[PDB]
Amino acid sequence: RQWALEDFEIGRPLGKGKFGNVYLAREKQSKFILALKVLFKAQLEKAGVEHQLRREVEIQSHLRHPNILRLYGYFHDATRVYLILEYAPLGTVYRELQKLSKFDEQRTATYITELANALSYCHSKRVIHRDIKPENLLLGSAGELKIADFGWSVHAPSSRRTTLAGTLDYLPPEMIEGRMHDEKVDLWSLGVLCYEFLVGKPPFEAATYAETYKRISRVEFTFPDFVTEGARDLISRLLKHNPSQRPMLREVLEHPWITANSSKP
Amino acid sequence: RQWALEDFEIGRPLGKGKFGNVYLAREKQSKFILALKVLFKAQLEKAGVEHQLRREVEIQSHLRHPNILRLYGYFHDATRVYLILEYAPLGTVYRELQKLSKFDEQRTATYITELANALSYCHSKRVIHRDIKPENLLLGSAGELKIADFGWSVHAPSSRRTTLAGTLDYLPPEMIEGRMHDEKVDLWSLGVLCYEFLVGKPPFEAATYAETYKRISRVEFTFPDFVTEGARDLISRLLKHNPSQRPMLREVLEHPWITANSSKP
């Protein structure tokens, strides 16, 4: 319908990002529990990202996959926009990592499997996330991982330009077939996560922003002793400077270390 | 300053795009001739491209190169936005091609040289145009080519995301060093132009939009008999399906066919 605020009972904050203030909510007629992600219009306008929010809604709302958070709808008033999200009751992977410091191999491999299933669904539909990180990985009621926060995602086949439908005559194949953007970006992220999950720190961590930038551009990481051979092999394959040398998701899902340790298919 | 409409005397239309209605104009205090590109706010909003206009202004206004059209400033009222452009007195390459049907080798090579100089300036600053085509190539007072219409251009180092300055920890090298976008897109365009300039038709031309899409994705072009060996070599090198096999601009500028025929350094 055209949902509005008065259709919901509001509960506690679930989390805060740079932009979203997310609240537990209950729809009044159904008593169905969900999450409201609230954004300030003034802040969206000041940062120049109103377009991104539009894309977050257009792209996420159409995805259907158990490892991807549903977005059900939206509404707005004079000062705010409200996104109606599936409620993830077990929090963020970020918070679980604060709690446990580091994950064992079985938990890590299980998370990587679920993330790779979600990203293969996305990438097969030309959706690229571009913001994979622990705070945007939520946990459902059986502890299964759910990708969320499609703020920076892209989907060339539904892009503004594609919809304008200009002449193709001067455009290369990569652009006309909605292949303009590189999905390998998400594969790097997956490697960063797998390392961080096992080690408790991301591979390119440093004091300053400048030192961090250097570490990443040079791919300067090392492994602690306890990281096993199989885990080193997978991380090393994902963290390639050259995007085209990073593996297909099918190779992540079938990696021997993954298949030996993952509890999920 | 804050220019407004009443600072200008308006003359004849210079051209029309999908969005810009461009007019000859004279600044009243100086009597300096320039062009006003006028956009309708309602149309920008309906097509969802207000962000692109912002980027057109931010990126173009800072470029300084004789083969790139200057953008001097902008202003707006209730229904319109006005871009203050350098006036190109000799029209579009599109119109010259309608007039002559096809260009000889010296004119073609000269245009390709000027375009490649302009694009090497851009690409060295991480500016990618993404809309190179004859209607967006203007002619200055000595018949020199000027790239224009930065509607679809990108410049990652000044992008909204870069300015937000989030954590780098999960992002690959390509993204943190503002290398996220592929400049090879413009090289393909240059190949399409070189063919069209010599032949009078673009290489992938077909009746329908669907047939055109196929021709491009399969790179199905052939040469007429009169296209010389040197020209075939350059076009063939630019029109590669794989973006990474397309040559550097320095190889275009130093191509033997280019250097034998071009009147410009």
Ligand SMILES: Nc1ncnc2c1ncn2[C@@H]1O[C@H](COP(=O)(O)OP(=O)(O)O)[C@@H](O)[C@H]1O
């Ligand atoms: N559906 C949800 N269920 C539970 N908590 C959520 C949900 N969506 C977001 N959160 C929490 O709110 C935070 C911010 O939400 P997010 O959509 O990532 O906003 P932003 O776009 O500002 O990063 C998340 O990191 C998480 O802590």
Ligand SMILES: Nc1ncnc2c1ncn2[C@@H]1O[C@H](COP(=O)(O)OP(=O)(O)O)[C@@H](O)[C@H]1O
């Ligand atoms: N500075 C200029 N001097 C002369 N003619 C121009 C100038 N700018 C644009 N034109 C003409 O107006 C047309 C539309 O302008 P353009 O900026 O390309 O608009 P759009 O963004 O709608 O494609 C050009 O193809 C050309 O015919």
Ligand SMILES: [Mg+2]
């Ligand atoms: Mg987030």
Ligand SMILES: [Mg+2]
């Ligand atoms: Mg976000």
Ligand SMILES: [Mg+2]
């Ligand atoms: Mg965002």
Ligand SMILES: [Mg+2]
């Ligand atoms: Mg144009």
Ligand SMILES: [Mg+2]
């Ligand atoms: Mg344009």
Ligand SMILES: [Mg+2]
């Ligand atoms: Mg445009």
